[PDB]
Write a protein that binds this ligand. Structure first.
Ligand code: UTP
Ligand code: MG
Ligand code: MG
Ligand code: MG
Ligand code: MG
Ligand code: MG
Ligand code: MG
Ligand code: MG
Ligand code: MG
Ligand code: MG
Ligand code: MG
Ligand code: MG
Lengths: 141, 315, 142, 266, 49
RNA sequence: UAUGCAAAUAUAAAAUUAUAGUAAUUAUAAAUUAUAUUAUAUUAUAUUUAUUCAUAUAAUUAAUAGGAUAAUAUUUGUAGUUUUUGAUACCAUGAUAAGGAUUAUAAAUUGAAAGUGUUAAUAUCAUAAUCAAAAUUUAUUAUUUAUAUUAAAUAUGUAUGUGUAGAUAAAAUAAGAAAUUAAAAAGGUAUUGUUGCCCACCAAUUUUUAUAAUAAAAAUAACGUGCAGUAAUUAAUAUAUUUAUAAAAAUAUAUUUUUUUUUUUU
C-alpha cells in the first residue's frame, strides 16, 4: 500500500480544446447518423440473396420440382415483397403450412452474416467489402 | 485491544472464558432475581397525566327533582367537563329572578356555587355581590352559626382566585380548624389557583398563612403546580417571611425543587410572555431558589474548576 | 490507487483486475453512453418505453437561484435548440456546452451526445512514464 | 497564536436569569469544561452550517440551484452560473410550492410516521430538532432553506447524539408525539373537541348516522384529525341500535374510552 | 486447581459455619471491606478492615 | 635446461613487529556454513489442455430528556456562548495473506507462521469520503468464433485473415494418463557469519632513525582505482627468473597449511 502520488495539474487552454473537440465530434456524429440511417433504410428496401441453404433438403431439390414449385406459384409475390430478408422469409414459410413443421427442424438456412448480402452477390469477399464508415451493425449493404 | 471496546455479550472469548460460563457446562439459571418484588418504585411519569380534570371540581349533588325542574336555567351553567359560553349577566339575572321561588337551602346554594364558577371562568367582577346579598348574612357575618355547603366555599374561593380580589382572606380564615374546617378537603388545583392569585396581588403574609396551612393539612406539595408556587414565592420581599420560605423550601422534593428553579428562570426569562400579567423583579428570591436547587441536587466533581487557583505550600 | 485523480484515490484499493457481479460495478462510468446506432437509435441507452414522461431533470422542481450545469440525463428538447440559452453539462476536464444547436439532438439524453472518452489526449496531465506507455499503445506520436 | 473555527458566539438564555445566575457555580464537564454547541453559533454561521451537510440536494452545494454565489471554479476553469429565469426557457417550470411537501395525517402510518417529504428528517419530538428553543414543525411553511432549524441534519456540528437519539426512538414516536403535542385537554376542563376547521366533518358524520348509514359514517370517521364531540358518538351508537349490531357499538364506545379522553363516557 | 467457570451467587450457600466464626459479627464487630491504597505486588487487592 | 659464479630450511632456540630505539603485541587446526547420479523395503513426471485482459466521485465526526385503560408535577415548551491542539490531504511501532518437494492407505484432508492497505503509547501543514448516472496505463486477468442475434434500472463499434513469432499458464483429488529418476562423502581470514571480512597503491599529518627513481620503518579514520586473498570466478603456498597504475601476473621447479574418487596378471 503506497501513499498515492498526487495527480498533476490539468493544463492550459485545454478546456477550450476539449469543448471544441467534443462539439465538432457531435457535429460530425450528425452526418454519421444521417448517412447510417440512409444506408439502413436503403438496405431494408433493397433485395437480398436467398436465406435457405441449397446444400440441404427440402432445398437441394431441382428448381422445377418440390419446394420451389410451392414457392413459384403460391408464395412468389409475398417473397418478393419482403425482399428476401431472412426473418420474414422464414416466417412466411412458417405460415404457408404446406411444409409445415420442417422449417426449423429439417431445413437449413445460411448463417446470419451471409444471408445479409445484396442480390446478385458472386464471391464471399462481399462480406468484408461493405462500407465501414457507417454504424448499422452489419445491417448495411 | 483497540479504541473500540469488545461488547461482552456477543464475544465468545468473553462469554466462554474462565470468568464466565463456557458452553460445555450445563447452561441453567445461576441465581433467581427478585428486583421488583423486594423494593418497589412508585410510578411518577416525567410527563404530566393526560386525562386529569385540571380545574376545580364543584361537586354537584342536586336532588333529581329540582335537577329536572331547573334544567332550562342550569343548562346555561357548567355541567361536567362542559363550559357553555352564555353571558354571565344573564345567568346572574336568572338566579336573582327564580331562586327565591324554590324552597331548599341545599338547592339554592348548589345553584349559586355553579353561578360563581361560571362567572369565575369569564372573570366578571360583579359576582361578589351575590355573596353579600344572600350568603354573607348567615355565614360570615357576626358569628352566625350556619355552616356553608363545601361546594359553595370552594366555588367562591375559586372566583376570588380567578378574579383577583381581597375578599378571599375573610373566607380562607373561616375554613381553618376552629371554623368550618373545610381545609383538608381542598383539591390540589384549589391550592394552586390560591397561591397563584395571592402571589399576583403580592401579599407575603397571605402566602405564609396559606403555605403554613398546606403543610399542616398534608396537601400534595410536589404536585402543586410550579407556576403558582413560583409566582407566590416571587411576591415575597419581607425578611421574616423570607426566613420562613427558606425553611419551608426544604419541604419540597428534589425533582420539584429543580423544576421550581427551572420554572422561575423561564418565567422572568423567555417565557415571560406565558403570563397574563408579567412578573415583578425579585432578585433575592429567585437567587435563593436557584441556590436551594444547587444544594439539594447531587454534586458533580469538577476538579479543574475547584482547584484552578490552588498552589502547594511546604509550610 | 496509484495516482489520486480525486479525493477517493486515498481511500480505495484497485485489487488487481477484479470481477464484479453482473452489472454492478461501484463506480458507474459509461464509456459506451455515446455508441452510434442507426437502427437502434431510439432504443439504445434511452427510455425503455416511448410512452414514459421525461425525467425529473427536464423540469425546474423548486425556486432556484439558478444552476451551473444541467444533469447529463436531461433529454434534449426542441426548446433546448430554439430558445438559445446556455445548456451546460458536467464533463471532464470541466464542462461541455451545447453551443451549436441542431434538431438531430432532440429526444436523446445528453448522456448520449457527450463523448465520455475523448481521443484528444493532453500530455500536460501525463507523467513522462504515462506518456511512454501511451506511446506503446500507438496513441501518442513518438 | 490563536486559531479558531468561528470568530464569535452567543449565549443560550438572556440577561434576567444570567446576571443573577452567574453567582452560583455550575459544574462543567470534567474533561472538556468549555462547551460550544450549535445553539451558540451566530446567525450567519448557523445559516452556513445548515446549508452544508446535505449531499447534493442541500443548499450548500453549488449545483443544487439554491446556491447564491454567481461564479464557481472547476479545476482552474471559472464557470458563470445560469440564472433561473433563463433556465426556464428550455426547461419548463413546475412548482407546486410549499404544500406539496406535506402529506395528510391519513398517510402518516404508510410513510412510517412523517408528514414531511423534505430532504432532512423531521421529528415531532421537541428535543431532536431543538436549537435553543424547543422545536416545532410548521406544516404550512416548509422550505428547502429551513429557517427554524428543526430538521435532522446529517453532518452539522453537534448532530451525532441527535442522530443516535433518532435511531433509538420508540416504535410509536413520530405518531405519539404528533398526537400529544397537539390535541390536549384545555386548562378549563373543556375538551379539545371543538375546532373550526374540522366542524363540517362532524356535522357530516352525525347527519349520515341519522339517516342510518353506519358504514358511510365510519368511513368518514376515519378521516378525523381531532377529537370528535360527544354528539358524534351518540349518533353512531344510536345508529347501531336498530340493526342489533352490538360489537360495532361496543368498539365505538371503546374507541372513545381512555383513548380519546373519555368523550364517549356519557 | 484453577477456575473453569465463575458465577455470582449469594453467600449463604457457602459461608463459614456458625460454630467456626466469632459470635454475632453484625453487632460486635464493625467491618468494612475496602481497597489497599498502596501498590500490592501480590495477594488480594481487597482486604477486610 | 648443471665446465667460470652461486654456503645455506631439515633445524641448539629465551614473547609479536622492526637493519637490534618506532607499534603493544602476534600466531593458531578438529563447534557452526543445503544440492558433487548408491540398492526400486516394496512400485510411474513425459501425458493432456491452455495464452489479445480494460474500468473510482461535487468538504463541517462533540449531550441526556420517558405520553391512553397508572391516585393528579405545564417537568404543555427541561434555553447558564466563548482555554484548548494527533489518525487529518501529514510524520506518528505492533497484528491474520500469497507461496506444492518425501510421517502412504487404513476405520483418514492435496494447503504451511515467519506476514499481504485499513488494528493499541513517537503527534505539531491543511475539513478532502460514495446518498447515484462520472476522466483508460494499471505486472498479477480464463469472453460469446458463422442455421435463426437489443423488450424494462442504461449496459459496450470493433481485431475476418493458413488454431499461425518468441516466450508463457494449469492438472495425477469420480474419475479413466504407467517405468523413469531421486535418501547417505566434503571448504570459511566470518563469528546471528558473503549485503561477512580483508589487499595493495593513491593525500594529509605523527614518530624513530643506518637517507637509493620519490629514503627506510611504525601509527593513521580522507580521496580515488580496482577487486588480490578467505578450495573466491585461470586452486593456493615457497624458492627461482621475468613483467608492472595498484593489488600482482607469466614461466621453471618443489608442495598441500586444496576438495578423493579407488585394474592385486582379464
Ligand atoms: O402552569 C400553567 C401553564 C400554562 N397556563 C396557560 O397560560 C395562560 C395564561 O397564563 P397565566 O397563568 O398568567 O394566566 P391566569 O393565571 O390568569 O390563567 P388561569 O389560571 O386564571 O386560567 C393560561 O390561561 C393558560 O392558557 C397556566 O395558566 N398555567
Ligand atoms: Mg462527511
Ligand atoms: Mg504488517
Ligand atoms: Mg623523521
Ligand atoms: Mg616512508
Ligand atoms: Mg590468484
Ligand atoms: Mg578475488
Ligand atoms: Mg584464486
Ligand atoms: Mg604465490
Ligand atoms: Mg617471485
Ligand atoms: Mg600489476
Ligand atoms: Mg609471485
Amino acid at each position: 500500500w503506497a501513499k498515492p502520488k498526487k495527480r498533476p495539474k490539468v493544463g492550459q487552454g485545454f478546456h477550450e480544446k476539449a469543448q471544441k473537440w467534443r462539439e465538432e465530434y457531435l457535429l460530425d456524429r450528425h452526418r454519421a447518423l444521417a448517412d447510417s440511417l440512409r444506408a439502413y433504410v436503403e438496405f431494408s428496401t433493397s433485395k437480398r440473396v436467398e436465406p435457405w441453404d441449397a446444400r440441404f433438403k427440402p432445398f437441394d431439390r431441382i428448381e422445377k420440382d418440390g419446394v420451389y414449385v410451392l414457392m413459384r406459384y403460391m408464395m412468389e409475390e409475398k417473397l418478393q415483397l419482403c425482399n428476401y430478408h431472412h426473418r420474414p422469409v422464414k416466417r412466411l414459410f412458417c405460415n404457408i403450412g404446406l411444409m409445415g413443421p420442417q422449417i426449423t427442424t429439417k431445413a437449413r438456412w445460411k448463417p446470419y452474416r451471409f444471408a445479409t448480402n445484396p442480390a446478385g452477390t458472386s464471391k464471399a469477399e462481399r462480406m468484408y467489402q461493405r462500407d465501414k464508415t457507417v454504424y448499422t451493425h452489419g445491417h448495411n449493404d | 485491544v483497540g479504541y473500540t471496546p469488545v461488547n461482552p455479550d456477543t464475544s465468545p472469548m468473553v462469554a466462554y472464558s474462565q470468568y464466565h460460563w463456557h458452553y460445555n457446562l450445563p447452561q441453567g439459571m445461576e441465581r433467581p432475581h427478585s428486583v421488583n418484588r423486594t423494593f418497589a418504585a412508585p410510578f411518577q411519569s416525567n410527563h404530566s397525566l393526560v386525562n386529569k380534570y385540571r380545574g376545580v371540581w364543584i361537586e354537584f349533588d342536586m336532588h333529581p327533582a329540582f335537577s329536572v325542574a331547573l334544567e332550562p336555567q342550569l343548562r346555561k351553567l357548567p355541567r361536567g367537563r362542559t363550559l357553555p359560553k352564555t353571558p354571565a349577566e344573564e345567568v346572574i339575572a336568572d338566579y336573582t329572578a327564580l331562586a327565591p321561588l324554590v324552597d331548599d337551602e341545599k338547592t339554592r346554594d348548589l345553584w349559586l356555587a355553579k353561578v360563581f364558577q361560571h362567572c369565575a371562568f369569564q372573570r366578571c367582577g360583579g359576582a361578589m355581590e351575590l355573596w353579600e346579598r344572600y350568603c354573607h348574612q348567615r355565614f360570615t357575618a357576626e358569628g352566625a352559626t350556619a355552616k356553608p355547603p363545601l361546594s359553595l366555599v370552594k366555588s367562591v374561593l375559586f372566583y376570588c382566585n380567578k378574579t383577583d380580589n381581597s375578599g378571599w382572606r375573610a373566607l380562607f380564615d373561616r375554613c381553618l380548624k376552629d371554623g368550618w374546617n373545610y381545609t383538608p378537603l381542598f383539591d390540589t388545583a384549589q391550592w394552586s389557583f390560591m397561591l397563584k392569585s395571592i402571589g399576583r396581588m403580592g401579599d407575603e403574609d397571605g402566602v405564609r398563612a396559606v403555605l403554613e396551612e398546606m403543610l399542616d393539612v398534608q396537601a400534595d406539595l410536589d404536585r402543586v403546580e410550579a407556576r403558582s408556587v413560583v409566582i407566590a414565592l416571587n411576591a415575597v420581599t419581607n425578611a421574616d417571611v423570607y426566613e420562613f420560605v427558606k425553611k419551608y423550601l426544604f419541604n419540597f422534593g428534589e425533582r420539584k425543587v429543580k423544576f421550581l428553579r427551572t420554572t422561575y428562570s423561564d418565567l422572568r426569562g423567555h417565557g415571560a410572555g406565558k403570563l397574563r400579567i408579567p412578573l415583578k423583579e425579585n432578585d433575592n428570591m429567585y437567587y435563593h431558589v436557584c441556590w436551594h436547587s444547587s444544594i439539594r441536587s447531587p454534586r458533580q466533581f469538577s476538579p479543574r474548576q475547584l482547584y484552578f487557583d490552588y498552589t502547594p505550600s511546604t509550610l | 490507487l496509484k495516482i489520486a485523480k480525486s479525493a477517493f484515490g486515498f481511500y480505495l484499493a484497485r485489487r488487481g483486475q477484479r470481477k464484479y457481479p453482473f452489472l454492478r460495478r461501484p463506480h458507474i462510468k459509461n464509456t459506451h453512453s455515446m455508441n452510434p446506432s442507426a437502427p437502434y437509435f431510439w432504443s439504445f441507452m434511452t427510455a425503455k418505453s416511448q410512452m414514459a414522461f421525461l425525467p425529473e431533470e427536464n423540469y425546474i422542481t423548486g425556486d432556484w437561484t439558478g444552476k451551473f450545469f444541467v444533469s447529463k440525463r436531461q433529454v434534449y428538447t426542441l426548446q433546448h435548440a430554439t430558445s438559445g440559452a446556455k445548456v451546460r453539462v458536467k464533463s471532464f476536464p470541466s464542462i461541455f456546452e451545447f453551443n451549436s444547436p441542431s434538431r438531430w439532438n432532440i429526444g436523446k439524453e445528453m448522456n448520449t451526445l457527450t463523448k465520455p472518452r475523448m481521443d484528444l489526449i493532453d500530455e500536460q496531465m501525463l507523467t513522462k512514464k504515462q506518456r511512454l506507455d501511451y506511446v506503446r499503445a500507438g496513441l501518442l506520436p513518438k | 497564536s490563536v486559531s479558531g473555527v468561528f470568530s464569535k458566539g452567543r449565549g443560550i438564555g438572556h440577561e434576567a436569569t444570567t446576571s443573577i445566575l452567574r453567582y452560583i457555580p455550575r459544574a462543567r464537564v470534567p474533561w472538556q469544561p468549555s462547551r460550544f454547541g450549535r445553539e451558540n453559533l451566530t446567525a450567519a454561521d448557523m445559516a452556513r452550517l445548515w446549508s452544508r451537510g446535505r449531499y447534493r440536494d442541500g443548499p450548500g452545494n453549488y449545483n443544487s440551484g439554491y446556491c447564491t454565489e454567481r461564479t464557481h471554479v472547476l479545476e482552474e476553469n471559472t464557470v458563470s452560473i445560469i440564472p433561473r429565469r433563463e433556465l426556464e426557457k428550455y426547461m419548463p417550470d413546475i412548482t407546486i410550492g410549499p404544500k406539496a411537501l406535506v402529506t395528510p395525517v391519513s398517510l402518516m402510518n404508510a410513510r412510517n410516521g412523517h408528514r414531511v417529504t423534505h430532504d432532512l428528517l423531521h421529528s415531532y419530538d421537541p428535543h431532536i430538532g431543538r436549537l435553543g428553543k424547543p422545536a416545532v414543525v410548521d406544516h404550512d411553511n416548509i422550505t428547502v432553506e429551513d429557517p427554524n432549524r428543526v430538521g435532522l441534519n446529517a453532518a452539522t456540528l453537534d448532530c451525532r447524539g441527535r442522530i443516535y437519539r433518532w435511531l433509538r426512538r420508540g416504535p410509536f414516536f413520530q405518531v405519539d408525539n404528533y398526537f400529544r403535542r397537539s390535541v390536549k385537554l384545555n386548562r378549563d376542563g373543556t375538551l379539545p373537541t371543538d375546532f373550526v376547521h374540522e366542524a363540517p366533518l362532524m356535522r357530516k358524520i352525525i347527519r349520515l348516522a341519522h339517516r342510518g348509514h353506519l358504514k358511510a359514517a365510519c368511513e368518514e370517521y376515519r378521516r378525523v384529525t381531532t377529537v370528535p364531540p360527544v354528539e358524534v358518538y351518540r349518533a353512531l351508537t344510536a345508529c347501531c341500535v336498530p340493526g342489533a349490531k352490538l360489537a360495532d357499538a361496543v368498539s365505538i364506545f371503546e374507541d372513545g374510552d381512555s383513548k380519546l379522553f373519555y368523550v364517549s363516557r356519557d | 486447581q484453577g477456575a473453569v467457570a465463575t458465577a455470582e451467587i449469594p453467600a449463604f450457600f457457602n459461608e463459614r459455619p456458625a460454630w467456626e466464626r466469632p459470635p454475632l459479627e453484625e453487632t460486635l464487630y464493625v467491618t468494612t471491606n475496602k481497597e489497599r491504597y498502596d501498590d500490592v505486588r501480590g495477594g488480594d487487592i481487597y482486604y477486610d478492615d
